[PDB]
Structure 1
Amino acid sequence: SRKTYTLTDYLKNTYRLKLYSLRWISDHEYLYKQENNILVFNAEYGNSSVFLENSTFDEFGHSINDYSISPDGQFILLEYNYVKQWRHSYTASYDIYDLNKRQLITEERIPNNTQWVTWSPVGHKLAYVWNNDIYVKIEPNLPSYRITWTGKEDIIYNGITDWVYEEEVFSAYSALWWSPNGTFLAYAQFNDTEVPLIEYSFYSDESLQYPKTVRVPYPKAGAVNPTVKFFVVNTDSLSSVTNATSIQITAPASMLIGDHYLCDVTWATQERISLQWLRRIQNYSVMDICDYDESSGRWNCLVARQHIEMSTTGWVGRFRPSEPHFTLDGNSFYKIISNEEGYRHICYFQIDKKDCTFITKGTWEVIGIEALTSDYLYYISNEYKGMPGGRNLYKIQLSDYTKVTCLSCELNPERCQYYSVSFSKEAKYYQLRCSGPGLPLYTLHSSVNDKGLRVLEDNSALDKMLQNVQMPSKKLDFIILNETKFWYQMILPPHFDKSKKYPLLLDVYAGPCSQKADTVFRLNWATYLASTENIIVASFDGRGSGYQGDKIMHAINRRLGTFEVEDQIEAARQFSKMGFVDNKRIAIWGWSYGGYVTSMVLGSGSGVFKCGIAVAPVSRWEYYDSVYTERYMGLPTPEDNLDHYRNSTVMSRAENFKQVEYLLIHGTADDNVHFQQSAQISKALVDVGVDFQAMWYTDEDHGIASSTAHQHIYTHMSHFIKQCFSLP
């Protein structure tokens, strides 16, 4: 008998996973922060030296939050006064420090309250955003150039995304795209004039006499959407006498015919951009290829180069149409696309020509394209052993598509079943990283022969640390439902005895393209529930789930809140018939989309579940945002899909909550799933006479991720599950 993995261990971070975060700066070199010094490494030989000592900024006088070194290694960007906005957005103060003359820059500094900064991908050019306007510096010590004058808070965004495009489209605040040369700056402009605003209260510190009101431009399903415009600046033709001239590239004629989004920007060469556009009805997309006319100074998008991506079964792309990956000369590219059978695979496109050629096939899916050389394409997929929750790096010979080599499958087959990768420029070297089912492993490889050079980080210290803990095990398997294989995991208590009966918590998310049953090693709340409290934490991947074909993923099209809910219950039904699960003690919990499913399941009247927790749930799809909702639900009108918008609320199931113990939790400053959603749920339960448990977390957003609130929510939830399960 040794110690168990405690709630305090999870919350206070007793056991930390080591990472190896490297930064490629050429084809054979990367940077890596050892302790606090920045060291430069040589990939081929493994030797290293100091780039920057831990003590270079001892008398800097600001809490340094992050850094970015310019491509040529001449300058360092320092980031302080970090203030978070949304998921990816923030403002900060910046400073530039010259690395050849060991001093700070004091002339013409970057402003306080900068929204976004980026180096040109070669050299030391700078682009930044301040008060919704784009500025450019050629030299760090020289005056910046004003590119746009239209910027205005909460209305016009130049070079930065608005709320919905940050969250749902680009997963970034940035709307800036340097050409590989650095010559051009491509950027987007967003117009949020007619976009309705979400208003909620923010209470701030005690000293604040009256509560503040937060106003965010946020389009709920069906409302008016932000418009978009695309521009390109020639940065080499900038002067301080004349104002900057930007060239506008307009959307294809088949997009201008209605409401539409800009969903992708990928530069092909020094003189060619690829843009993908999406129709407001997200089942139709057009890739447009645009070339720079040297003589005119203009950009042309020839109709001959237009490529359509469509779906008759659902929406385009997993969450959006995939990125292209161009060959060097920019005359051809590779792209993941759904094939005839609905499985996602690499297609070979030729710029001027029709159709495409699939270079992979099979009842599995390519997860991403990672690297391109003249001889090989490198991609991550889930082929190995027909395991959709597994991931390995593969490589295809471009002169013969039949020659496909797995590069990560047989390296550590017992510890490593889930990889990602980071390739150097020109793809000479790659860092492989596995994240389960054992402890994370970081290694360096070489593209010439795929020789394994170095172990970078093996989490050895953590190994010996957890050997003294009563750690839980993970079980990955599948069940049959209507002749189809659906996968689940269970987090299993230590000294698991199949002849004893354990209570079961169902961990749910089950949104479109989700995956909750995989091979990743996690140290979480579920880790504690299994190790200390001896509760089996199960997870299931039903209809609407990802990486197993459009038949499974598109089952939920226009029908959210149906099959993903039904299959959760059928999974719990099958788990309950198993000999080691106590059918008197089954619970369900979920966050975000998972809190919506949880509540739907609890209000279903199935009788399978004793209790459940829903954290920051969606309640009614008309409350959530346009880009996410409409992807799967259409418009909420009589002509379109109003009937199922109204069939699928938590509120309409209120009466069935009499049969269960319910815990509802929401942060009051939640800008994503607004408090409104839970507020509406509770009203319907109160109006119908159902007793339940509530918890609001004031000033917390969707993550509820302030250290104190984080600790408080998991503590509150732990007490609820233990009392639900008659555990002292």
Structure 2
Amino acid sequence: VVGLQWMGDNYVFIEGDDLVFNKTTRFSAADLNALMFPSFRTLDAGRGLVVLFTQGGLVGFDMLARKVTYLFDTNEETASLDFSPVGDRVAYVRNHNLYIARGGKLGEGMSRAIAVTIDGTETLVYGQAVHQREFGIEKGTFWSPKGSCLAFYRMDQSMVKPTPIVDYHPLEAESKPLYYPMAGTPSHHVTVGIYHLATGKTVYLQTGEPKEKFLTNLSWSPDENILYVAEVNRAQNECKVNAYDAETGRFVRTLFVETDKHYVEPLHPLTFLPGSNNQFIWQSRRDGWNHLYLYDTTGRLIRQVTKGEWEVTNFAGFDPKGTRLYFESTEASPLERHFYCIDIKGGKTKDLTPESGMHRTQLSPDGSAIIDIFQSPTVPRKVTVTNIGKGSHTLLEAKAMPEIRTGTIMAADGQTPLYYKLTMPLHFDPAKKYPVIVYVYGGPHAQLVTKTWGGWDIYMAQKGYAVFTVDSRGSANRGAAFEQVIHRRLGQTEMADQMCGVDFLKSQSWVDADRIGVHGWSYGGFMTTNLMLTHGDVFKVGVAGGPVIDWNRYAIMYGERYFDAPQENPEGYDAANLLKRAGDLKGRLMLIHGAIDPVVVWQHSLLFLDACVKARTYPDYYVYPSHEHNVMGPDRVHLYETITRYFTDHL
């Protein structure tokens, strides 16, 4: 059901040719083409306003009125586009600087874009994501809700020592500095500008010292008078939610402060109640579980709205009156996602999607209805549309492969339940012994085992290899205690729990205990390498892609949260520094890296090979010179074949 979404009070989808509306009407590509089924980006679901990407600029389109809105000329920039909530202007970044282009109405001619900044360059970045995209930061432009102002980040990274990123395709290779701030080093300096459209004036927030402070979750007041910022200290154990005057940039007040033994991690903006300039919802994991908190703008906590030993995983919004909250959570089970209603006064949740498994739900603009997309181990796809507190309507339902087994084991503490998935060999025979590969990630913010319906496990299984994954402690959606055990000690608990997975595998009669392998990417590449070095008698063969190898060389804003700074934690960093234990490699391990990886710099795997040379140990290697952190697109076929053949050759 291509593009299933809300447009006004209609739910909408594509039929290769038509856009179909239901509350039935149909809008074809030729109907549309006459007014200039293609791709679009929805800008305003309530109004069904979208933008169409065409040869020769952007065309805004009102799908409810069936009328062109505006033509935009952004000099071919698309990545950084951020349309005003008014819908008639768009911000974007081009050749280092921030611009605003105004939409032009059909046959009324165009105006030249406004340059918000003029001194952007390699070490001075405007209007883009900062702080290595930590703290929920995905972009660097933030329109005020009435379109009067454009707030934006200014990142001076001139003090950061860069890493070369080399393009090998020109005749002579060309390097460009990547200002990647490594653990324990000087951070970049971010400030927040606000460009006022009426006056063309810019003011900077007076965020003050230390200049390294992290400026996160920018959130405008509904009346546009105040810009709120969640400021996080370098230690990452204090978050202050502060109000700044949008007119002058002056500090107004600190609403509240959160602190934690290990770390605080704000990830979501303040969300104001409907029709209110004075009350908002703030997400916080302060009580050990991510919950919704109701605050007024003086900083006074009215009440914790949600509570329980489960986590809110998506805040979807309010009823029109702002007396109810809608949200996705783990309340039913950490392996599941359901959509709920709760009174703003708190109390009992009501599960609006009760069936056991994974629900992905979209609340209608008017808050009256939901689109639900469901899948489970027995149900490939069930698409429903429901009038909340009324009838439900099914729109679509779907109905030798490797067998997938699931269950629970105890973690190394002997108390915490861990959930696993096991992809069995194709045509598995219980009388036979099989090799098995532990596919591991194990890092924060991910959860690999859910009650659901990129298939590398199935490919391995088709080659006669079982694939086992377990979500060890450190992993997500199980509360802060379950995650924070890793603090200052990366790899230690994670590997202990992965070895409980191995204990379970060895308890299976059909497992060949002498043919156990391991594979993972990124944090999973760190884990793969660490497991081979630490448990060299168990793990015969592994493949580690884009692996972290020396945490001192990972980015400040992620690494120092989980590990603290290298100066504060030499014992922990040293224990996880795989360069120090390269002489423990006694099996077959291939490392793979994208050469232009700006997340885990190529240096990590290169230094490991260098360490292995000195240590006289013998890893294998592959480099994708055109790829960044992950191998994307058709080349992923080459990746899977390289990884698979390594295991079929050696394990």
**Same fold by TM-score, threshold 0.5 exceeded?**
yes
* C-alpha displacement of 1:57: 8.9
Structure-2 separation of matches of 1:103 and 1:336: 38
Is the 1:544–1:556 Cα contact (8 Å) retained in structure 2? yes
Task: Give secondary structure in 2 for the equivalent of 1:362.
Answer: coil
Deviation of residue 510 (structure 1)?
Answer: 0.6
SS in 2 for 1:563: helix
SS in 1 for 2:417: strand
1:710 match: secondary structure: helix
2:447 pairs with one of 507, 512, 515: 515
- 1:592 maps to a residue whose letter is S
Q: Aligned runs of 1:152-551 on 2, under 5 Å?
A: 152-162=120-130, 164-165=131-132, 167-170=133-136, 172=138, 174-204=139-169, 208-235=170-197, 237-238=198-199, 244-251=200-207, 256-257=209-210, 259-271=212-224, 272-290=226-244, 297-298=247-248, 301-303=251-253, 306-312=255-261, 314-317=262-265, 320-328=266-274, 329-340=276-287, 342-355=288-301, 357-373=303-319, 374-384=322-332, 387-399=333-345, 401-410=346-355, 413=356, 417-437=357-377, 438-447=379-388, 449=389, 451-455=391-395, 457-458=396-397, 460=398, 463=399, 469-482=400-413, 483-494=415-426, 496-498=428-430, 500-521=432-453, 524-530=455-461, 532-551=462-481
Counterpart residue identity of residue 260, structure 1: K
Does the Cα contact within 8 Å between 1:75 and 1:98 map onto a contact in 2? yes
Q: Does 2:491 align with 1:561?
A: yes
CA distances 1:660-684 after superposition (whole Å, capped 9, x unpaired)? 2212212222222122111111111
The CA deviation at 1:596 is 0.5
Q: Deviations over 1:229-259 (max 9, x none)?
A: 2233333x25xxxxx10233222x6xx2452
Matched, 1:595 2:560: no
Report what 1:87 is aligned to: none
- Report the AA paired with residue 267 of structure 1: W
Distance 1:402 1:105 in 2: 46
Tell me if the contact between 2:409 and 2:500 (Cα under 8 Å) persists in the aligned partners.
Answer: no
Name the CA shift for 1:66/1:220 in 2 (closer, same or farther; >3 Å).
farther
**Displacement of 1:190:** 1.6
- Offset of residue 586 of structure 1: 0.9
- Whether the 8 Å CA contact 1:334–1:349 is kept in 2: the answer is yes
Q: How does 1:72-221 map to 2 (within 5 A)?
A: 76-78=51-53, 94-96=57-59, 109-113=73-77, 116-140=80-104, 141-162=109-130, 164-165=131-132, 167-170=133-136, 172=138, 174-204=139-169, 208-221=170-183
Q: 1:234 to 1:614 in 2, by over 3 A?
A: same
Aligned-residue offset at 1:156: 2.0
Which residue does 1:33 correspond to in 2? 14
How does the TM-score come out when normalised to structure 2? 0.90
Kindly state the Cα deviation for residue 23 of structure 1 after the two structures are TM-superposed. Answer: 4.5
- Taking the aligned partners of 1:125 and 1:301, their CA distance within structure 2 comes to 29
Distance 1:606-1:212 versus aligned 2 partners, 3 A rule: closer
Change (3 A) 1:372 1:578: same
State the distance in 1 between where 2:257 and 2:61 align: 47
Look up the equivalent residue of 1:110 and give its one-letter code.
T
**Over aligned residues, Cα RMSD in angstroms?**
3.0
1:674 alignment counterpart: 601
Amino acid at match of 2:385: L
Distance 1:176 1:694 in 2: 40
Separation (CA, whole Å) in 2 of partners of 1:33 and 1:180: 30
Structure 2 segments unaligned to the other structure (5+ residues): none
Q: Distance in 1 between matches of 2:83 and 2:637?
A: 38
CA contact (8 A) 1:436 1:520 kept: yes
User: CA 1:699–1:360 in structure 2 vs 1: closer, same or farther (change >3 Å)?
Assistant: same
Partner of 1:83: none
Q: Which runs of 5+ in 1 are unaligned?
A: 1-18, 81-92, 239-243, 464-468
Helix, strand or coil: the match of 1:276? strand
Q: Which residue of 1 aligns with 2:6?
A: 24
8 Å contact from structure 2 (residues 255, 300) kept in 1: no
Deviation at 1:591, TM superposition (A): 0.5
Q: What is the CA–CA distance in structure 2 between the aligned matches of 1:624 and 1:594, rounded to whole Å? A: 14
In structure 2, what is the equivalent of residue 241 of structure 1? none
Deviation (angstroms), 1:346: 2.3
- Aligned residue pairs total 637
Is the CA contact 1:188–1:231 (under 8 Å) kept in the aligned structure 2? yes
Q: Which has the higher contact order (CA 8 A, sep 6+)?
A: 1
Does structure 2 conserve the Cα–Cα contact (< 8 Å) formed by 1:490 and 1:538? Answer: yes
* C-alpha distance after superposition, 1:126-175 (max 9, x if no partner): 2222223222234424424535234422122222235x53x434453x31
Distance, in Å, in 2 between the alignment partners of 1:389 and 1:113 is: 40
Separation in structure 1 between the aligned mates of residue 521 and residue 534 of structure 2, nearest angstrom: 18
Q: CA 1:32 to 1:132, structure 2 compared with 1: closer, same or farther past 3 Å?
A: farther
Residues in 2 aligned to 1:70 and 1:355: alpha-carbon distance in whole angstroms = 33
In 2, Cα distance between equivalents of 1:209 and 1:693: 28
Aligned counterparts of 1:665 and 1:657: Cα–Cα separation in 2: 16
Contact 1:200 1:669 in 2 (8 A): yes
Aligned counterparts of 1:264 and 1:382: Cα–Cα separation in 2: 24
Q: Report whether the alignment pairs 1:570 with 2:570.
A: no
Structure 1 CA distance for aligned equivalents of residues 519 and 531 of structure 2:
10
Give the superposition deviation at 1:31.
4.8
1:491 Cα shift?
Answer: 1.7
- Aligned counterpart in structure 2 of residue 699 of structure 1, from 626, 642, 645: 626
In 1: Cα distance, 2:507 partner to 2:650 partner: 20
Residue 86 of structure 1 corresponds to which residue in structure 2?
A: none
State the alpha-carbon separation in 2 of the partners of residues 492 and 29 from structure 1: 44
Question: Which digits, 9 at most, give the CA deviation of each residue in 1:315-342, with x for residues without a partner?
Answer: 113xx443333212032222332344x2
Shift of 1:454: 4.2
Instruction: Report how far residue 655 of structure 1 moved.
Output: 2.1
Relative distance call for 1:144 and 1:126 in structure 2 (3 A) is farther
Per-residue CA deviation, residues 278-317 of structure 1 (Å, 9 max, x unaligned), is 112111111123566xxxx5466532x51112111x1113
**Corresponding residue SS for 1:369:** strand
Asked whether the equivalents of residues 476 and 518 of structure 1 are also in contact (C-alpha less than 8 Å), the reply is no
Contact 2:190 2:212 in 1 (8 A): no
Instruction: Report 1:606-645 matches (<5 A).
Output: 606-637=536-567, 640-645=568-573
SS in 2 for 1:509: coil
CA distance in 1, matches of 2:408, 2:416: 13
Which amino acid in 1 is paired with 2:53?
L
The 2-side partners of 1:498 and 1:203 are apart by: 50
Alpha-carbon separation, structure 1, partners of 2:103 and 2:471: 52
- Matching residue's letter, 1:597: M
**In structure 2, what residue type is equivalent to 1:441?**
K
Contact 2:61 2:69 in 1 (8 A): yes
Deviations 1:186-217 (A, max 9, x none): 2222212212211132211xxx4211113222
Give the AA of the match of 1:647: A
Residues 1:722 and 2:648 aligned together:
yes
